[model samples]
Structures are given as C-alpha cells and as structure tokens.
Target: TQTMKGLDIQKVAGTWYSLAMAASDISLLDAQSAPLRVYVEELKPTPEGDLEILLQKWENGECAQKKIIAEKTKIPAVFKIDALNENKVLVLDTDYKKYLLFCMENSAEPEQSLACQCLVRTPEVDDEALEKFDKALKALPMHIRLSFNPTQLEEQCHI
Candidate 1:
C-alpha cells in the first residue's frame, strides 16, 4: 500500500485555463486561431516539494486551412518535476512570465516546444500574493537578456 505524502493532490484537481500571455510582441489575439486555451488537471506533488503538471490543449476549427499553423492535441502532457513553495510551484523550464506567454500562445498544440515555467498556485492568489511571487521569481538565479533600439522623435513648428 502506497500513500501520498508531502503532496497537495487536492490543490491541483481543478482545471486552470490560460487567461493571457505576458509577451508584448506576440499577442494571443494575433495567433492564427487566436485565443488558445489549455486544460490542466491531476496535479501531484513530489517528495522535494515540486509539482507535476498534466496539460492538454483544444484545437481550432480552421487548423487544417493553414498548413503552417500548428495543430492542437487531445492527449495529456506532463511537465518535468521541479521546486515549489508554500503557495506556488515552479516548473524546470525558463522564467515564469515567458512560459505563460508561450503556453497561452500555443495552447491548442499539445507537443508545442517553448521555454516556460508553470507556477501552480491556490485560487486565493491576490495582489499581495502575486507581489511575493514576483519577488521570489526575481530572486531566482536566472539571467535576463534584453536588446533595445530607441530613437528620438522630432517635432516641426509651422509659421
């Protein structure tokens, strides 16, 4: 007889739908199908306080119309086990914000390969909770790479 220990199986039993992505370049509304949706269920915790996420995505009606467009999957997927906190769980991937955008953009596709970090949390995730989450995320040993080109706008006066 095996017992589940150190795992908050109940906290992961419901479905978590994708609300929005954090990417400024890629908008969920601009996708071929637009507004991708994902279904997460059967969340299990590990001995090291990490979580295992089971995910699936819904397909678009006109997916076949666009060959270049990615197809959604009906099968469930599993993310790698990683670390967790009291109210949040982290996936062994890229940053959490980037991951959110990737998942939301390609929700219909099951085998979509993108860098991300899924943070599973309780339904009571308030603004303060989110602030803590952000703080903790910033504290992680991750490097941020960014490039930008800025130009000054000139105004002309007419007499």
Candidate 2:
C-alpha cells in the first residue's frame, strides 16, 4: 500500500477516533467493528533530536497504550517502532483530520502474520467518512466485521 511522505510529526500528533478496523488482531479488538479512540501526545525531543509519542487508548476496561520511539526511514510517514512492539507502523494515508493506520505483527506461526488496518477520524465521523469505512469493510471477508459503539454506530462504539 502507499504511504504518506514528508510527514511532520507535530501535525500528525493528536487525538484520533477509530471508525473502523479490519482484522482479528488485538488492535482490532477481536475483529470488532466498534469505534475506538487514540490520543497521541507527550511529544518530546530526545538528546539525539528523536521524537517520542505516548499513545493512549482503552481496551475493554483497562488502558492499552504504548510509548512509541520512532526512527524515520528515507520514506516519510514510515517509521520503525520496536520499543512499543517489534513491528512497523505505516501511515497509509492521513491528513490529521483522518488517518488510515496499518501494522503487521508476526505471531508464533510465520504463515500467519496478524495484520490490522484501522480507519480513524477526528472531531467526528461524517456521512462521507462513514460511507467510505463501510465500503472498505465490504471488500473484506464476511468473517471480518465492523460496527459502531454505544449504538450500531458511534465514535463511542462497543463491539
């Protein structure tokens, strides 16, 4: 997939809402369609001038968060994060207002790498954004699901 280039970490850091996710990985909440929230803050420059972001999120009842230390490659929006987890995260697309985050985690079985793709939006989910998420969901396998929170749809989704 394509990715965002020349990304400024400052502009990319903020609160994002999960509108839809496709996968059975932990990031997907057991393949739940419910919306989730992500708060990326605490940006600090290291002695080496590297940037770090504390990603805050809620899983079930407990807090599921990670402190990400990024090392940017020649490509923009592409960074390797091994501290948070031994995996790479790519900003497939985003404008701060919305983002498509993709990551892959290799499990015990090499043949099965847990892949998760999440659609995130800021402020709120609009009709067009929601429609786009739905269309993407349709292209996935029937077993891969999507839903909204508090209701069948919400930024406060509960799958």
Span of 10 residues, lowest total lDDT, candidate 1:
150-159
Q: Write the per-residue lDDT of candidate 1 for residues 1-159, one digit (tens) a residue.
A: 011223233344333322222222232323333332222333444444344455443344422211111121222222232211011122322222222212221223312312222332322223442343344334333232111111100100011
Model 2 off-target regions past 4 Å?
Answer: 24-28, 31-53, 57-61, 83-85, 104-111, 117-123, 130-143, 150-159
| Candidate 1: clashing pairs of residues | 72-108
- lDDT of every predicted structure (CA atoms): 0.27, 0.47
Put down candidate 2 lDDT per residue, 65-144, tens digits, no spaces: 65777666666766666642334555554455565454433334312333444445444445565555445445334334
In angstroms, give how far residue 111 of model 2 lies from its true place.
6.5
